[PDB]
Amino acid sequence: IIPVEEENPDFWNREAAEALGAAKKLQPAQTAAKNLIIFLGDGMGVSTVTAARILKGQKKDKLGPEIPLAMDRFPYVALSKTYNVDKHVPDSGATATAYLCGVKGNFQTIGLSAAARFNQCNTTRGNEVISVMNRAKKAGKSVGVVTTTRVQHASPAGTYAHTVNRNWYSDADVPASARQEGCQDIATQLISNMDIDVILGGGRKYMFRMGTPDPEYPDDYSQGGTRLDGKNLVQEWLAKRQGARYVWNRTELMQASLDPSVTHLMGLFEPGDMKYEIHRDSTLDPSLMEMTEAALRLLSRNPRGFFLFVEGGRIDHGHHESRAYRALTETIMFDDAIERAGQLTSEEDTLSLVTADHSHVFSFGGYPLRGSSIFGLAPGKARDRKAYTVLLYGNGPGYVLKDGARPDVTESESGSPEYRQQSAVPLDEETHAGEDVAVFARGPQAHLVHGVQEQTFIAHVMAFAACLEPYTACDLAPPAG
Amino acid sequence: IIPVEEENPDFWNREAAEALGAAKKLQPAQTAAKNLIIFLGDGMGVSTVTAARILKGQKKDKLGPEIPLAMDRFPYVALSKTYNVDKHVPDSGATATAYLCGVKGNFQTIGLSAAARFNQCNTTRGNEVISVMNRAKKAGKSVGVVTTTRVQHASPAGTYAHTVNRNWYSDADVPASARQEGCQDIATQLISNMDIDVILGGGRKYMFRMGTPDPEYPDDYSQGGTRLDGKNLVQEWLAKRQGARYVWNRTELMQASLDPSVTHLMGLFEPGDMKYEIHRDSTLDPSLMEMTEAALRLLSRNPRGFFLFVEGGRIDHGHHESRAYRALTETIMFDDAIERAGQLTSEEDTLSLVTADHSHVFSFGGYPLRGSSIFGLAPGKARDRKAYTVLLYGNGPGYVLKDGARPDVTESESGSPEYRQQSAVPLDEETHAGEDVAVFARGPQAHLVHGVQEQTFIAHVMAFAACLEPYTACDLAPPAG
Numbered sequence: 022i023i024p025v026e027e028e029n030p031d032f033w034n035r036e037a038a039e040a041l042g043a044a045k046k047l048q049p050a051q052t053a054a055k056n057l058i059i060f061l062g063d064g065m066g067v068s069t070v071t072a073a074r075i076l077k078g079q080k081k082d083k084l085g086p087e088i089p090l091a092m093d094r095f096p097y098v099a100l101s102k103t104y105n106v107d108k109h110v111p112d113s114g115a116t117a118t119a120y121l122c123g124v125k126g127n128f129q130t131i132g133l134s135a136a137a138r139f140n141q142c143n144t145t146r147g148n149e150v151i152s153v154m155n156r157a158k159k160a161g162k163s164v165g166v167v168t169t170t171r172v173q174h175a176s177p178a179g180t181y182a183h184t185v186n187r188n189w190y191s192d193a194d195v196p197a198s199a200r201q202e203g204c205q206d207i208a209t210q211l212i213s214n215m216d217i218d219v220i221l222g223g224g225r226k227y228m229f230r231m232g233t234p235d236p237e238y239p240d241d242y243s244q245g246g247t248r249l250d251g252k253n254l255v256q257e258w259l260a261k262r263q264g265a266r267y268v269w270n271r272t273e274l275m276q277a278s279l280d281p282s283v284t285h286l287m288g289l290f291e292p293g294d295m296k297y298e299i300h301r302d303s304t305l306d307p308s309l310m311e312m313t314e315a316a317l318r319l320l321s322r323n324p325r326g327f328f329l330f331v332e333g334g335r336i337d338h339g340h341h342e343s344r345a346y347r348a349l350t351e352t353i354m355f356d357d358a359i360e361r362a363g364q365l366t367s368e369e370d371t372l373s374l375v376t377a378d379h380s381h382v383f384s385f386g387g388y389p390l391r392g393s394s395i396f397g398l399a400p401g402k403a404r405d406r407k408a409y410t411v412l413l414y415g416n417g418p419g420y421v422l423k424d425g426a427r428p429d430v431t432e433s434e435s436g437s438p439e440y441r442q443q444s445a446v447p448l449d450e451e452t453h454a455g456e457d458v459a460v461f462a463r464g465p466q467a468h469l470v471h472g473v474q475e476q477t478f479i480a481h482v483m484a485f486a487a488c489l490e491p492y493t494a495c496d497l498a499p500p501a502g
Numbered sequence: 503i504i505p506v507e508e509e510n511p512d513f514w515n516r517e518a519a520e521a522l523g524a525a526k527k528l529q530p531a532q533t534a535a536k537n538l539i540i541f542l543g544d545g546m547g548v549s550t551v552t553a554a555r556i557l558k559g560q561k562k563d564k565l566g567p568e569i570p571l572a573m574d575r576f577p578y579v580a581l582s583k584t585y586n587v588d589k590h591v592p593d594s595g596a597t598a599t600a601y602l603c604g605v606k607g608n609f610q611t612i613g614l615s616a617a618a619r620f621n622q623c624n625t626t627r628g629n630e631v632i633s634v635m636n637r638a639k640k641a642g643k644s645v646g647v648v649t650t651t652r653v654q655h656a657s658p659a660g661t662y663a664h665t666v667n668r669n670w671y672s673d674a675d676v677p678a679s680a681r682q683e684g685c686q687d688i689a690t691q692l693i694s695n696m697d698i699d700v701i702l703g704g705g706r707k708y709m710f711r712m713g714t715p716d717p718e719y720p721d722d723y724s725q726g727g728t729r730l731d732g733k734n735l736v737q738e739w740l741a742k743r744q745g746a747r748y749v750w751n752r753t754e755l756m757q758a759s760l761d762p763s764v765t766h767l768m769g770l771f772e773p774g775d776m777k778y779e780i781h782r783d784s785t786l787d788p789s790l791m792e793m794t795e796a797a798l799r800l801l802s803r804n805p806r807g808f809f810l811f812v813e814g815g816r817i818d819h820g821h822h823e824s825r826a827y828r829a830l831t832e833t834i835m836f837d838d839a840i841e842r843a844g845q846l847t848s849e850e851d852t853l854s855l856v857t858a859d860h861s862h863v864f865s866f867g868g869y870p871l872r873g874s875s876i877f878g879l880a881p882g883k884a885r886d887r888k889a890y891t892v893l894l895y896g897n898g899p900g901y902v903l904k905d906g907a908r909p910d911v912t913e914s915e916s917g918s919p920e921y922r923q924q925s926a927v928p929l930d931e932e933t934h935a936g937e938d939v940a941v942f943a944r945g946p947q948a949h950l951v952h953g954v955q956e957q958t959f960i961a962h963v964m965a966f967a968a969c970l971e972p973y974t975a976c977d978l979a980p981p982a983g
């Protein structure tokens with residue numbers, strides 16, 4: 022459909038005049054960032070952003086593409102080059118090293134320079150690269166890690182961990198030789214490497230000894246503790262800190278976040294990754310936005326400021342399943358968390374960056390009409406006389422042949438939360454994609470986020486803005502009130 | 503392969519430190535743009551840019567992704583929302599209206615507000631929106647249109663034409679009713695709507711009466727004149743202007759561009775679109791870079807400045823064929839033209855924008871090793887036990903079933919200039935994609951290109967920078983020397 026107001030050139034001329042006015046008003050800060058937030062949309066490439074924008078727009082009863090996401094309102098944009106040192110199409114671990122530690126690494130390692138080698142424990146030491154979050158903590162800031170994945174998953178692990186193998190969630194995953202060589206599982210590193218004030222996400226199971234029933238699924242043994250060393254890492258973490266609280270459900274999280282005596286909060290809401298938002302039990306589990314707010318309640322108390330990592334972690338997972346419905350709904354929730362954080366913080370003293378670790382082979386094509394559902398069929402039949410969807414994947418588990426032929430698809434099928442968009446090539450999991458991703462920035466020194474940059478720039482501009490190592494001689498004035 | 507220098511964190515820290523230094527040195531101009539250049543990569547979405555960067559890097563014997571394209575060096579980047587008023591996934595005509603005239607339009611129309619309707623001549627009048635190029639000419643600037651497509655193709659036509667049907671190249675294409683209603687074919691509009699100092703690209707055939715042999719293919723009747731009105735539009739254009747020259751080959755173009763007495767130059771190098779660079783006859787046909795230089799030689803003479811449109815027009819065509827080899831080699835040539843223009847102009851007085859009209863359902867995935875060919879196979883077999891390529895398309899003519907199965911592919915096959923990457927859905931032509939495209943900007947007022955903008959912003963920032971209508975009260979100082 023053609024919106025009538027848009028048929029008039031004045032509509033476009035006014036909008037552009039306003040955009041020019043806003044552009045002209047942008048001025049760089051001469052002051053440091055008190056607070057740092059990185060919002061990481063895992064797998065949230067440019068095609069994901071646009072498709073999510075359209076979906077979000079339509080959920081708000083608009084046509085879609087004209088409605089800004091919260092991230093779209095950020096004044097500064099750059100393109101970020103995501104290649105890992107060893108692979109053009111990266112993984113989450115080595116990209117986390119880039120955007121969290123400011124150094125590129127090798128595929129499937131975390132918090133290590135590219136001198137380290139995947140799954141070779143004996144290449145670890147000397148190659149640890151320290152995250153901006155770690156540097157923020159050393160400088161006296163409170164720090165928080167919030168994600169819809171396991172808190173031991175590759176992205177959040179980038180803020181605290183150093184490992185040659187992102188798969189080493191608990192000691193059960195670490196080969197005996199690596200255990201003897203002292204390569205700690207990620208769950209251990211979570212509680213041991215550094216003090217983290219707020220830890221929120223999934224990954225209960227890695228914290229408890231094998232045979233420990235999960236509190237939420239005591240009748241599903243597969244959800245229980247994984248640990249072989251008999252340690253209760255939650256208990257160990259709590260014992261180290263007065264005012265520390267552990268929560269496994271939403272209501273306790275709420276309670277803890279409002280409690281002045283709670284100085285450290287660990288909230289682990291599922292045994293593994295958290296449920297997709299569309300599957301979330303809102304009585305038991307906090308949304309990403311809620312976890313973000315909980316974190317900010319505690320982190321904001323520190324007069325020295327905070328560093329916060331917030332991950333839309335299952336955007337990535339939706340794309341891997343080639344279920345764009347899941348990828349895009351996760352993206353919207355992620356954008357909602359960005360919006361919520363912007364309400365709770367000031368751009369006068371908070372540098373906020375939104376980015377992705379990398380993209381996916383997700384495309385938005387055909388020639389759909391304005392206002393049509395992002396999950397709909399492209400107008401017109403394909404050359405095999407069957408329908409096709411506007412959303413497609415280059416590869417992944419949506420590839421199907423029924424009776425030797427590409428299956429037809431209906432609008433009813435294509436719109437289902439379980440629908441897998443078709444691909445060119447069958448794979449159990451759709452792949453990441455290697456094209457540049459966006460960086461959106463606002464707050465002190467956000468104007469430094471510009472042009473086309475290496476992904477490592479994300480970490481460096483954040484360290485610079487808050488005058489953290491290696492930029493303690495940042496030459497910035499104190500954060501604005 | 504892992505480049506040794508990149509294994510050291512210092513490599514990344516130094517690079518980022520330098521990037522921060524460069525970012526900090528950026529300062530907005532207080533002065534106007536004397537010259538305006540828009541480089542339009544037709545179909546050149548973010549995945550195209552990255553894949554082209556890698557290819558270009560490797561052509562220069564580097565690993566690929568670490569080597570900047572000329573466009574990558576532009577300091578200011580924004581995301582541009584490409585939706586047409588009536589379609590989420592746009593065409594070249596209505597996007598041209600946006601980035602050339604600053605108003606969004608309906609799919610397959612050119613230079614018209616969205617009050618007009620595709621293929622309805624009687625909805626034209628009153629809906630004409632004037633291009634920045636036209637406004638530049640009114641302000642006394644010289645103006646140039648350079649493209650590897652027909653100069654009457656949708657993108658270049660955006661600079662001068664107003665039509666409800668981009669397919670109306672010559673009067674032969676215009677239905678009798680539209681001809682009677684005075685809807686001029688694009689070739690006519692090219693010579694009649696406005697004075698254009700330099701016109702370079704394809705589209706000879708639309709200028710000459712049916713039965714006129716093409717000068718380059720006199721023995722191929724299909725390449726001859728198309729016109730039904732008996733007009734020689736080249737002769738008409740020449741007759742209107744003293745110092746006007748028409749050329750149909752490279753050597754005459756060279757000659758004309760160096761000739762002080764040549765004030766107007768029309769160079770039409772093929773009957774229709776120009777050959778892909780990989781097929782170009784370098785004795786008969788100028789590359790895009792050469793056409794760009796020729797144009798700049800003439801345009802730069804005017805003390806009031808110039809507006810120049812330069813299009814990498816067949817990037818788009820390569821993707822439609824699902825021949826990434828063609829899309830990417832066109833992209834490199836386009837980037838070479840950008841580089842060449844930057845050598846011949848000063849960013850002190852020239853605002854240059856590089857953008858795309860829209861993207862394609864082109865993806866770069868699998869998990870290829872650093873330094874591997876962009877046209878190679880993804881490591882590892884697909885679920886059907888056959889190989890697949892790192893480059894894929896969501897849809898398009900690369901979809902194949904041999905003996906009811908997806909064909910296997912070899913590196914030799916996949917690397918061929920004729921190879922069509924596989925897709926999920928067979929279509930005669932692969933489709934455009936609707937995700938945001940990049941805008942790169944440098945020169946006076948380039949800092950205004952930021953954040954996420956409507957595609958119309960491109961036209962408006964250019965008009966603003968050169969103090970053209972509607973921004974004659976730009977309040978900028980005269981262009982810097």
Ligand SMILES: *[C@@H]1O[C@H](CO)[C@@H](O[C@@H]2O[C@H](CO)[C@@H](O)[C@H](O)[C@H]2NC(C)=O)[C@H](O)[C@H]1NC(C)=O
Nearest residue numbers: 136137138140141142143144145146198199202
């Ligand atoms: C990391 O450990 C591996 C042990 O697997 C070492 O690899 C061995 O190196 C020796 C000498 O080069 C070879 O003869 C063995 O065959 C290798 N073992 C295996 C099973 O791969 C490697 O040297 C160690 N790296 C470091 C940095 O100490």
Ligand SMILES: *[C@@H]1O[C@H](CO)[C@@H](O[C@@H]2O[C@H](CO)[C@@H](O)[C@H](O)[C@H]2NC(C)=O)[C@H](O)[C@H]1NC(C)=O
Nearest residue numbers: 236237267268269270271272273274304305306
């Ligand atoms: C959220 O977690 C809290 C803390 O574990 C749960 O509270 C416990 O619930 C059991 C069963 O009702 C009681 O016997 C304990 O006394 C409670 N402990 C505390 C500290 O209150 C609470 O039930 C959980 N919420 C849900 C919906 O399961």
Ligand SMILES: *[C@@H]1O[C@H](CO)[C@@H](O[C@@H]2O[C@H](CO)[C@@H](O)[C@H](O)[C@H]2NC(C)=O)[C@H](O)[C@H]1NC(C)=O
Nearest residue numbers: 617618619621622623624625626627679680683
């Ligand atoms: C453009 O021309 C078309 C002629 O095709 C006009 O459409 C006609 O309008 C009348 C009255 O609405 C209908 O009864 C006819 O059936 C239409 N003709 C056809 C064949 O479509 C249209 O009105 C014109 N638009 C403008 C702006 O004048």
Ligand SMILES: *[C@@H]1O[C@H](CO)[C@@H](O[C@@H]2O[C@H](CO)[C@@H](O)[C@H](O)[C@H]2NC(C)=O)[C@H](O)[C@H]1NC(C)=O
Nearest residue numbers: 717718748749750751752753754755785786787
């Ligand atoms: C490029 O175009 C020029 C101009 O049309 C061609 O020059 C003509 O060539 C014919 C055949 O040799 C001569 O008889 C004419 O005298 C030439 N005209 C002029 C004005 O020089 C030239 O041949 C073309 N180049 C190529 C390679 O075809």
Ligand SMILES: N[C@@H](Cc1ccccc1)C(=O)O
Nearest residue numbers: 111112113129337338341450
């Ligand atoms: N990122 C995906 C799968 C993956 C495999 C290999 C490398 C990178 C990613 C996941 O963990 O859900």
Ligand SMILES: N[C@@H](Cc1ccccc1)C(=O)O
Nearest residue numbers: 274275278307310311314315
């Ligand atoms: N923003 C959250 C607040 C919250 C914080 C902590 C736990 C739960 C909820 C909400 O909408 O509910």
Ligand SMILES: N[C@@H](Cc1ccccc1)C(=O)O
Nearest residue numbers: 592593594610818819822931
């Ligand atoms: N842009 C393509 C095909 C196309 C068809 C319909 C709409 C837009 C584009 C071309 O002209 O080569």
Ligand SMILES: N[C@@H](Cc1ccccc1)C(=O)O
Nearest residue numbers: 755756759788791792795796
């Ligand atoms: N840059 C062009 C110069 C040129 C201008 C005009 C015509 C032909 C060539 C070249 O490399 O040849």
Ligand SMILES: [Ca+2]
Nearest residue numbers: 290291305306
């Ligand atoms: Ca739960």
Ligand SMILES: [Ca+2]
Nearest residue numbers: 771772786787
């Ligand atoms: Ca030729």
Ligand SMILES: [Mg+2]
Nearest residue numbers: 063113176334
């Ligand atoms: Mg992640």
Ligand SMILES: [Mg+2]
Nearest residue numbers: 544594657815
């Ligand atoms: Mg074009």
Ligand SMILES: [Zn+2]
Nearest residue numbers: 063064113378
């Ligand atoms: Zn990821």
Ligand SMILES: [Zn+2]
Nearest residue numbers: 064337341453
């Ligand atoms: Zn992933």
Ligand SMILES: [Zn+2]
Nearest residue numbers: 544545594859
């Ligand atoms: Zn196009």
Ligand SMILES: [Zn+2]
Nearest residue numbers: 545818822934
């Ligand atoms: Zn096209």
